Symmetry: C4
């Protein structure tokens, strides 16, 4: 519409200085007001009622801290390791298809750049359905030290996927995240309303993963596990890791929040030793360092964010991604000091209050008449004159 | 009022194309804006505070899924069996009196048509208080393969009901659903405010059902059971099934959500074998395939919807009913794939997280002064110029 | 102010026909829009944050029904007995001081009239601080069959109270309800803001009640008990009854909802036989027949309402009280039929679902940024043209 | 901005008479409307999402009373003892840096004055980062009977802190509250957005406190403990007391509400005798006498408020502080009468209902379409003409 130019007004010049960005929600607001209707619908949408999408975040709020005091926290280290490599931050940029919807000029290349340019380098998971080619995304990387993982959607035509694995493996990607939570559609009504899957094989099986292991040296991570039973199965077929995720609530609605599954899983993996034999990642609904800290405290090897970095890139490009990185990086550090720990390893569950972790409620319907007619108290107002 | 013509503006032409209908809530919106004040009041109203009416829905949100991954879900079948016959969908259109309030021209005939015309055929329960005669509703049916059940309100003058049973049985209806949850009024204040039961015998007893079994070969289903104790009693007198329902919250307010009772009942029916000897249906507050999947997972033989199909028919007639059917049908399929099952039989409770099923809360009153005076955080705004 | 005449507009002629009053909340709305600022502030106010005031109502919503079906409910009886006498309804009009604030001409006399005029006769508890004299309130009673109890606030000057007991006892009041929950102020900020207790002895003791028993033949009921421990003490000194109440939330804020205390108490009184030796009443936050039914199901001998009848009288006088009486009377009847019982005695707890009775929650603070920036789904709109 | 003069209009003359101030929330309202943007941002802000800040308050609402009746409460005493001295009230004014932001002329001196001028004298904790010098704040005190404690932020340059301790000790302060919950920043985004720690040593350790005990005769209280484990450690090194606090939610977000920790701690301190050997204070989110009563009932020696007295002083100065003092003092008295106790010692947990103390919930995301399309009940309106 002509209103695209109304956005050009917002977008151009009116965007606040990247330094004036205080948190990840700021990137989201700016994005909702500048991104094209198609882009925004695709980025911000979840499946159906978007309950799980939102529930992913809400669940973090069922966990409170039990911080230690009078501990020397002058020095604090947040670097850790993931899938064999050493990472500067305990978080990473998750796979998001069609980044050119928000970043028409550079797409995933600006993400690749933003992730490995600055002082801090974040692992970037590359989407099978990215707007750019795996070649130009891996080449865009400004650091030999930065990590890039590849998200795999196995094709119905396995020959195509067979080659893909070969190509990205050759291109140097450090690992393979095969997305198992998107066999079907996962209706995005926000997008649908706007218009007014052969690439994804609906027949993937544990046997196929068993065969994927033979066709690659790259660490394999089954992205999209939604139950402890499958985390165990992953360990059984011996894959490198698993990502407790529900696709950011873009797939099955009423899928539990990954953090809630994490809390259930780890203890079982610990009462079976599998703890060290399987790297459990977790994503969806993470917007603050404190969220990352709860996941890390429960056992997650690393925590992933999708939409925040997506919105950052769609507003400020490569630099926004770096700003987002710094932001989340500083939040993890400061809150760590306040928790009384100086390293990621020291991040244990004993620092968490999980007593209300299952206070996932649904009250009874509001009494509209009683509360409508009721007049609440008031603050003492100023003199008129 | 003259505003009826304001509705003719909405209704006529302004109604969005039936294909532009994304979900069941859409039928409801359109309906609230086009149906006559009397029709809307009668269709949308519940008893008193409409707590149960709404609670019926809310309860589904206390159940989350535990979906299986890496399972071949290319093929998925949702057909099942209900009261002896084979059904294409695990859901059905429940009885709703006076369909001509919303569909003046065809009333229940368009529901009959919409249910058996398309590729998918849904069982239609026919109301004793329907606007059309049982003869013209059964004749309206476009398919020999479609199922039509009859909802019975036993009259005080049992002679009238005796004949009814004979007539609808002769007319070919597949089963008798005798409604036991409406012995009294069940005040609909929305309707009452607008105006500013001899047909239903208040003396029905288990003995009467015992005698109804003798006067008919048709499967008998006691519609309106609200406690496990009565499901058991139903099994004791040997009726064909039962419908855990509270009349869509149009009768006793503060009656539990049927899905909540379902979860309590089935395990008892299983620890008594009665499970297979009694077909437990469940209705009220079902608006999405995921709702139908939770009930099917708990043990329901079939799930029923009343208002959604009512609103569909009142806006788009026969075709709206088919659209609503397709919609709910596609939602059940897709979410099924995402759960990791390929058939209705595979839908078991192990796919459900019922840990917060009883988190039916009522918080303490809001502190209006504390939260009134409190100013919340803000997103970083755009530059003015 | 001149706006008092703006109220004269509302009040006069504009008030809807008393028949057009559907429920007790209707009386409240009309009242808030017609009563004088002083009257409304005094009638509608509770102590401090008005949490308990509101909590009294909310608690009823933590109790759901388990109604029996296929039970002959043609005939239904709601008459019961209280403090020796036989009552038509299981509820009564509780004591409310200064009824002339809302009913300048007749005050408590219209309440006395409304309670004993019509077909149904409700016990009226008479307040020590009523606007009328105990003589003219008892004389205003249009029925020999109607009951009138007296609410007693023992004076610091016990001589005055000694005489009062003699006088009202002589005047024929059936019982003495001595209010024990108002030794101090109980700040009504709504009223206080408007202005911009020697009568109540703060030294009352169980010993004084023991002496009150000797100076009267009238059944004594300690009004305002807020803990099981005191219900037991009441039974120990041998008084006639007790009223689990917190003064309608006009006294101590954060006092439990009486229904919540009732549910705790009765079982203890039953495991000690005291059940029959002590009549437990319960008031506050009761606005519907279903509320009355839950209390009666838990064990309450009778349920009291204050503000509803107060608002009724302040809007429609004697007749409003009768309308309110009919209203609550019809609600108790209809819901009873729906529960599957035909008498008050048959109202037992087995008809209640008390599994979420303690789901008195206080969620964690809302995430203002996450939910602010979030855009929710939308209903498919109509065509513009 | 020029709008500072718009505030001068509010502030000057338009402020309601100090007597017209009904509660502590009133001081807050007036303050939000008259304090400079910088002052208000700094006074009203919490860290990040301000969840803990708000949660501190909300937690009090998970505790209800079990008040005793028929107890002589004519006389009621609220004086108690804290850190060796005798106090008139069981509460105190907590340390708040930069009081001159809100009270440019007198700052902390007016707090000092307001606390010791009137009939009632409240202990004033003096901040290390106060706008005034410790000398002029201690000299401002109008009473020899008033108590003044000193809040200590140990400097990285311990020599500076060593002197401070010597000076304030010499100046006569009664105790040392060394703040251990602020080693790092604790981002106040409200303030940050407005702009668009060498004084606090991040290396403080239990050993340092052990050495602070040797350099002073003053009772030492570790302010900012957030877990039972540290309360125990405090007792182990033998300090005088502890303050269960999270800095008013200005530090770690998702730190539990201190009252919630109090309830967990005391019983452990009692099952170890430590109860009398360690004075447990508690602050944050206290706005009413009933809040102070719950903390006192759980075992707190004294309860502290920060913002309320801060807002009082920033609007009405010395007199506002006295008004706030009177207000909170009257609220504690009245509610005490209503609870059935006459002294602070009689305040025990048996007067508390802690059964829903852990009902800290986070419901599942609202179903926006279902509740959007739903039309709720309505009150019967007045006649138009
Ligand atoms: C927002 C978004 C997420 C996508 C994403 C695209 C978008 C725009 N997609 S999708 O188009 O196929 O649905 C992918 C993708 O390419 N592949 C994948 O495995 N995950 C995909 N995800 C999910 C992603 O990997 C994270 O699970 C998700 O973003 C995490 O949720 P938050 O955004 O809430 O952190
Ligand atoms: C909405 C509605 C429901 C009616 C219905 C009429 C309407 C307009 N009515 S009623 O006139 O007596 O109240 C019937 C009816 O004819 N007979 C019956 O057994 N159920 C009747 N029901 C209830 C229906 O069978 C389902 O239980 C109900 O609609 C399910 O609730 P939802 O609409 O929330 O799915
Ligand atoms: C609304 C109201 C209630 C009063 C009442 C006056 C009003 C205006 N008052 S009071 O002025 O002293 O606080 C009395 C009274 O005279 N004596 C008494 O024992 N109860 C008194 N109550 C409390 C009454 O007996 C019931 O407990 C209360 O009204 C029940 O709460 P609901 O109004 O919420 O049903
Ligand atoms: C509101 C506020 C609180 C401050 C305070 C300043 C303000 C404006 N500050 S701060 O500049 O370092 O963040 C202090 C302070 O000087 N030192 C300290 O120990 N506590 C400080 N506190 C915390 C205070 O001691 C209480 O813990 C806090 O105010 C209690 O929370 P409520 O305000 O919710 O009662």
């Amino acid at each position: 519409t002509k209103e695209d130019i109304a956005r050009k007004e917002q977008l151009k010049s009116l965007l606040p200085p990247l330094d004036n960005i205080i948190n990840l929600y700021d990137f989201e607001y700016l994005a909702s007001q500048t991104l094209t209707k198609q882009a925004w619908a695709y980025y911000s949408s979840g499946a159906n009622d978007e309950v799980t999408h939102r529930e992913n975040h809400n669940a973090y709020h069922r966990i409170f801290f039990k911080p230690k005091i009078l501990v020397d926290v002058r020095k604090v280290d947040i670097s850790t390791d993931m899938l064999g490599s050493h990472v500067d931050v305990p978080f990473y940029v998750s796979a998001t298809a069609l980044c050119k919807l928000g970043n028409p000029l550079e797409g995933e290349k600006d993400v690749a750049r933003g992730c490995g340019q600055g002082v801090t380098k974040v692992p970037q998971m590359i989407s099978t359905l990215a707007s750019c080619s795996p070649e130009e995304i891996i080449e865009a990387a400004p650091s030999d030290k930065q990590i890039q993982w590849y998200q795999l959607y196995v094709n119905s035509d396995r020959k195509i996927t067979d080659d893909l694995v070969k190509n990205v493996e050759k291109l140097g990607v450090k690992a393979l995240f095969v997305t198992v939570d998107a066999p079907s559609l996962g209706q995005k009504e926000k997008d649908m309303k706007l218009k007014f899957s052969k690439f994804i094989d609906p027949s993937l099986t544990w046997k196929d993963i068993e065969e994927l292991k033979k066709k690659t040296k790259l660490p394999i991570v089954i992205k999209g596990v939604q139950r402890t039973e499958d985390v165990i199965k992953a360990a059984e077929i011996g894959v490198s890791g698993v990502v407790l995720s529900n696709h950011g609530g873009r797939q099955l609605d009423f899928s539990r929040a990954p953090i809630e599954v994490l809390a259930e899983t780890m203890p079982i993996l610990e009462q079976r030793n599998l703890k060290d034999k399987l790297e459990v990642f977790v994503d969806g609904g993470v917007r603050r360092g404190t969220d990352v800290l709860k996941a890390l405290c429960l056992g997650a090897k690393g925590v992933g964010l999708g939409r925040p970095f997506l919105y950052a890139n769609s507003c400020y490009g490569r630099n926004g991604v770096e700003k987002a990185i710094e932001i989340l990086r500083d939040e993890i550090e400061m809150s760590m000091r306040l928790l009384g720990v100086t390293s990621i390893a020291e991040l244990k569950p004993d620092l968490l209050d999980l007593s209300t972790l299952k206070a996932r409620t649904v009250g009874v319907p509001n009494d509209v008449l009683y509360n409508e007619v009721y007049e609440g108290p008031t603050l003492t107002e100023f003199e008129d004159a």
